């Protein structure tokens, strides 16, 4: 099957069309401005540009399309999908009392955060006083796919989670549905399942098959995990980016409020997650990528630095141990930059190790192997340290681009996760 994945991320958007029979693919991209006063037009136009850059003979073969978007980016629209105010972005927080959400979700629910879609919807409710029932709140992915299939109030149980959805029971609470916000809530499907055929005019304009199906979407981080192709419980993806982000596939859902750990539903499984403030950003405080790699090549992995670092970029750690007061621990500083770098990498390695240990201690399926993403993935010495410390097979992820994972989502759904 030839399928199209669309990734709308934090800095831009990418389209990947893939024939999963010949395993052949094509990828195109657009870049966002740092700031916009009309993000809906930016995203919509980006969608059209992405479609345009894809070769016509690829578009003529695309059978299924899926879209991932940033988690917490929402749009308040009318019944026609027309935005009634500026979107609230993923990284924006709303000055609301979380107690106002208490009767709508369980006590340990991930939606109980000032940056959640639910919190934002409530913020809008307060701002407007009363919201018309014919209106709708849509995730970025929801709205963008709405541009393609024309079905209003449609979402997935990944995006809908922080809107107040409970994927463990597959429903919004009765209280939330019966409330003054219920009519704006979307119909929730499993990511990957067909929502409806592409709109005729869109298909004609972009030379797509009129029978091309538009699927339920997902989030960009989940799509990133889906790119790896890991579908066995105990398999994990480590993102060695600016911050170290761990995602572990598990048969058991786990969560922890203070460390920000929670679990997405993933077919019959659960994707548990945890993010440390430690990461590449701490490394960039001392070395540029070039010098970082050149110095990395000189490290003897059989030695130990004798340094016990906790490489925070600044005050406060979230995961594996929540500590808002913890300062960066980078003393002492050896004269040798090689030993110093080794201390740093050892620290980050400890962060990863203790991270997966933490997820397991919360009840998650024990770790079997690591697929690595992010800029640190190709650091061989670092991978050696991680291998020695963690004790499971570690390799570079086959794919890391969210658009590819979303393409796989369109092609096969979540069928592999049972």
Residue numbers in the entry: 2 to 419
Give sentences from the paper.
Synpcc7942_2462 from the cyanobacteria Synechococcus elongatus PCC 7942 encodes a putative sugar kinase (SePSK), and this kinase contains 426 amino acids. The At2g21370 gene product from Arabidopsis thaliana, xylulose kinase-1 (AtXK-1), whose mature form contains 436 amino acids, is located in the chloroplast (ChloroP 1.1 Server). SePSK and AtXK-1 display a sequence identity of 44.9%, and belong to the ribulokinase-like carbohydrate kinases, a sub-family of FGGY family carbohydrate kinases. Domain I exhibits a ribonuclease H-like folding pattern, and is responsible for the substrate binding, while domain II possesses an actin-like ATPase domain that binds cofactor ATP.
We therefore used single isomorphous replacement anomalous scattering method (SIRAS) for successful solution of the apo-SePSK structure at a resolution of 2.3 Å. Subsequently, the apo-SePSK structure was used as molecular replacement model to solve all other structures identified in this study. In the SePSK structure, B1 and B2 are sandwiched by A1, A2 and A3, and the whole structure shows the A1/B1/A2/B2/A3 (α/β/α/β/α) folding pattern, which is in common with other members of FGGY family carbohydrate kinases. The overall folding of SePSK resembles a clip, with A2 of domain I acting as a hinge region. As a consequence, a deep cleft is formed between the two domains. After comparing structures of apo-SePSK, RBL-SePSK and AMP-PNP-SePSK, we noticed that these structures presented here are similar. Since the two domains of SePSK are widely separated in this structure, we hypothesize that our structures of SePSK represent its open form, and that a conformational rearrangement must occur to switch to the closed state in order to facilitate the catalytic process of phosphorylation of sugar substrates.
